[PDB]
A paper describes a structure:
[name] relies on the flavin adenine dinucleotide (FAD) as well as N5,N10-methylenetetrahydrofolate (CH2THF) as methylene donor for activity, while nicotinamide adenine dinucleotide phosphate (NADPH) acts as an electron donor. Combining biochemical, spectroscopic and anaerobic crystallographic analyses, we showed that formaldehyde reacts with the reduced flavin coenzyme to form a carbinolamine intermediate used by [name] for dUMP methylation.
In addition, we attempted to study the reaction of reduced [name] with CH2O in crystallo. For that purpose, we crystallized reduced [name] in a glove box and then soaked the resulting crystals with CH2O in the absence of dUMP under anaerobic conditions (FADH−•CH2O). Under these conditions, we found that CH2O diffused within [name] active site and reacted with FADH− in crystallo, thus forming a flavin carbinolamine as ascertained by the optical spectrum of (FADH−•CH2O) crystal recorded on a micro-spectrophotometer directly coupled at the X-ray beamline at the synchrotron. Structures of apo-[name]/synthetic flavin carbinolamine and FADH−•CH2O were determined at 2.8 and 2 Å resolution, respectively. A clear additional density on FAD was observed in both structures, specifically in three out of four FAD molecules present in apo-[name]/synthetic flavin carbinolamine and in two FAD molecules in FADH−•CH2O. This density fits with a CH2OH group attached to the N5 atom of the isoalloxazine ring and is thus attributed to the N5-C5a carbinolamine FAD adduct in both structures: in the first case, it is the synthetic compound, while in the second it is the product of the reaction between FADH− and CH2O in crystallo. The carbinolamine adduct adopts a butterfly conformation, significantly bent along its C10a–C4a axis with a dihedral angle ~12° and its N5 is pyramidal, consistent with an sp3 hybridized nitrogen and alkylation of N5. In both structures, the carbinolamine groups adopt a similar axial position lying toward the si-face of FAD and interact with a water molecule. In the case of the FADH−•CH2O structure, an inorganic phosphate occupies the dUMP-binding site and makes an additional interaction with the carbinolamine moiety. Our structures are perfectly superimposable with that of the [name]/dUMP/folate ternary complex previously reported, with the phosphate ligand placed at a position similar to that of the phosphate group of dUMP.
Numbering used by the authors:
A (entry chain B): 0 to 30, 36 to 91, 95 to 218
B (entry chain A): 1 to 31, 36 to 92, 96 to 218
C (entry chain D): -1 to 216
D (entry chain C): 1 to 33, 37 to 219
Write the structure that this text describes.
């Protein structure tokens, strides 16, 4: 499998894929020739005939902090299956470099330490409550937003391109930009013609034209 | 895998992503044993845990009369790409057996002939208009509802099961029931555990428990 | 809430109901900053800002219900818009009335025909008359409606209720209120745009200026 | 119409389009078409699974809920949401503190009153850390990651009667977490008030949960 590490403990892993660039060509024509088929992909992208790209589907396995997953799960045109907090416990601790370009009254390394401290105290409280007989669904409410979760994400190339427009962009939070770069990399590997046509004609973000 | 329907129709499997284990994987979130896995499929189906079945996706190539495709395209939770009537000619002629169980004042063979006569006259009216310089988008409005169309259908196992509940049923028009039987057969071949578990616990129709 | 626009020879687009207006999108957007409605100038500015920068989810809180009478070839195209709700007349249970879209000779203006446009109109009426007569003969003889209706041409009128939010409605206008779309659906999309303009003037104006991809509405 | 939920939460009806008769109109168009016949049609639609007419009834809710509740709720894709952003808003001291009664029926080695206190303590410590980071110049989007899952959020929810009934089947049920059950009871109450025939028919023929057939 194709697996990209994200943040300190996260990842994006390709689980499955149905189709490639020719799946959109076949769907558009309702039925190869490299030059005519690439020309069609570009024609579809430039004129907004996006429905043929829905016949390309991906399944990802993603490990991400809850604050990142909350943003991600806002994308309704997809399928999700997530780990339940009701039925390990790792946390995203930003490195001092996350604060590069910000003027802080305390050194960036003390911000990292303060974050570790509060997650350690939160986690210890959670374990103490669980050991005391408190149900998991109640005890987990003390856990911070940087707690890592895992989910399977099934999405088609059209909804994936919408996700890249919105998340592979400087206005999106830096943490989800990182995940969106890994999504774009896997997408580019499986659908190079669709990805190149997307960048040239439909892509509304900024970071994929620079990175 | 291709199944012939009606006089000139078909259902053909173009592609598939996943199998029964894709739903097992999604329910667990991980990327066990055959008996435990088959038991989990049944457990998910009996308790209405349907989201894991969304990670199994199919692409079909369907050739169907427009009156059948109009009913089929009412299923919004799926992807379609159809032949265009403006730019992109065979018709569904029911056999006398289609009227078995109905008391008609004219012989069922005369009904078949009357239907052929209409398609012949409308088709020739269409060709006359086209030859006279009338644009295709205008001339085609005279064509009857039994005109065959072709489409690509990308659907997940969850929306496919909803389609079987509604169309592989005696309340659905007989013509779409024929198409739904072919969809059920391809589904059964690719996902035998999901299909078997669906029939036992979730299936609301009647014809799949008889045919 | 009520509006009705006549389309083609026998069709229409009628506004049945509407939930919200421009301020519904303002309220939905402001939750982001823990705020709500402010003043008319600031609120109108926010609508334009949302539209220009692609902040489309607030426009989903504005919903419309339409009652449409359209030929089946138009409705087939329309029903491809999945992010909406539909309830249509059934050819299986209803006895179909003599209503078909007959294009007027003016529909072929700009086209060189070997027969007069008036004869195209007449040829269309003749084939629909024969198809309709065959349909009535079959249902009178005991053929089930669901079988007898298959002989009916694509210009047969249908009726449907359409519940759609302002975001999906704007997608519909981008695709159908455009010169590449068939002239008949363009007519329906103009009526949809006109009702939308009346109920959501700020959203409509911002759509035309920043997001609208078609040509005919400009 | 505003219903208070938990210690600081709520469900408020913002807007509604349609009523029971909206579903009656949508259904009768099939056949090119009084109170007793209309109520009978609603029951017929519900019992035979004719659900699309109920999509023409739409609601807008304004909900204040803890993030762990909002996370489960937002899993309902057939709806529209607009939420408070943790990136642009300065967060207020609004956290869900369960009362000792939340642990009734559970054998704990510490008193339930100590569980409530332990939750408040860690909430107080995490909130103080958040404020210290924010005051130090740490961007909000980074600083808020230390905040616990019981932090309250606010959102607008636009949903039709069909997706709302799916939500009640799954959340107004004893298998759903107690906290979201509370929210689903308030949703059911507002739905019952606006669509009494649809609600009554739903309970009698389509409702798969348990708590709405026991709780008034
Ligand atoms: C930089 C940034 C900041 C913020 C946010 C996002 C970004 C990038 N978002 C999330 C978006 O609103 C949206 O949910 C997401 O981008 C998915 O964005 P989205 O585009 O709505 O994705 P989708 O997958 O749900 O749907 C895919 C497509 O399907 C259509 N669609 C689907 N369901 C529909 C329906 N019901 N009605 C109409 N059309 C519908 C529509 O065309 C849509 O593009 C916020 N949301 C919010 O509530 N408050 C906020 O402050 C913010 N903001 C801070 O986080
Ligand atoms: C025997 C029979 C007779 C008739 C018809 C059908 C049959 C079987 N149908 C079609 C159905 O109404 C429905 O469109 C279709 O079955 C898809 O049926 P459907 O069940 O609506 O399927 P979907 O794929 O569109 O969506 C899949 C699931 O997703 C959810 N969903 C999707 N979009 C939603 C949304 N916007 N709001 C809420 N939930 C929504 C919902 O849970 C749904 O089950 C008719 N429709 C109509 O208008 N008049 C009629 O006389 C008839 N009737 C004559 O043909
Ligand atoms: C120039 C040109 C030419 C053609 C076509 C389009 C254009 C622009 N089409 C496409 C077809 O007309 C399409 O079904 C309608 O435009 C419906 O449009 P949406 O998908 O935009 O609306 P819809 O209402 O279905 O969805 C609205 C929005 O939600 C999103 N969406 C909904 N469902 C989705 C899903 N499953 N996956 C990903 N995203 C989803 C999309 O972002 C979409 O814009 C076509 N069709 C055809 O069959 N044959 C043809 O020959 C042509 N030709
Ligand atoms: C008690 C309990 C326990 C859990 C969960 C729920 C509940 C009630 N869930 C969440 C569950 O998987 C699901 O996300 C929602 O609760 C149910 O949302 P629906 O998909 O039914 O509604 P939603 O509003 O998303 O959709 C409504 C209807 O539309 C259809 N639909 C929508 N989008 C679709 C698509 N892309 N494909 C096919 N059909 C679609 C379906 O018919 C569905 O019923 C969960 N989840 C989890 O990940 N792990 C877990 O451990 C649990 N545990």
């Amino acid at each position: 499998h194709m697996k990209i590490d994200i943040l300190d403990k996260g990842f994006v892993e390709l689980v499955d894929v149905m189709g490639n660039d020719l799946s959109a060509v076949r769907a558009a024509r309702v039925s190869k020739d490299e030059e005519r088929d690439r020309h069609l992909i570009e024609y579809l992208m430039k004129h907004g005939h996006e429905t043929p790209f829905e016949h390309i589907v991906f399944t990802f396995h993603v490990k991400a902090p809850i604050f990142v997953a909350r943003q991600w799960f806002r994308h309704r045109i997809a399928s999700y299956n997530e780990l339940s907090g009701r039925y390990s416990y790792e946390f995203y601790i930003p490195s001092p470099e996350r604060l590069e370009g910000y003027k802080t009254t305390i050194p960036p390394e003390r911000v990292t330490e303060k974050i570790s401290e509060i997650v350690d105290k939160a986690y210890r409280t959670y374990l103490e409550l669980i050991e005391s007989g408190v149900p998991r669904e109640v005890a987990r409410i003390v856990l911070p937003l940087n707690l890592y979760t895992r989910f399977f994400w099934t999405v088609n190339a059209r909804s994936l391109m919408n996700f890249l427009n919105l998340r592979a962009d400087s206005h999106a939070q830096w943490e989800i930009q990182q995940y969106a770069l890994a999504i774009a990399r896997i997408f580019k590997e499986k659908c190079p013609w669709t990805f190149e046509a997307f960048l040239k004609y439909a892509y509304k973000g900024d970071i994929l034209k620079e990175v």
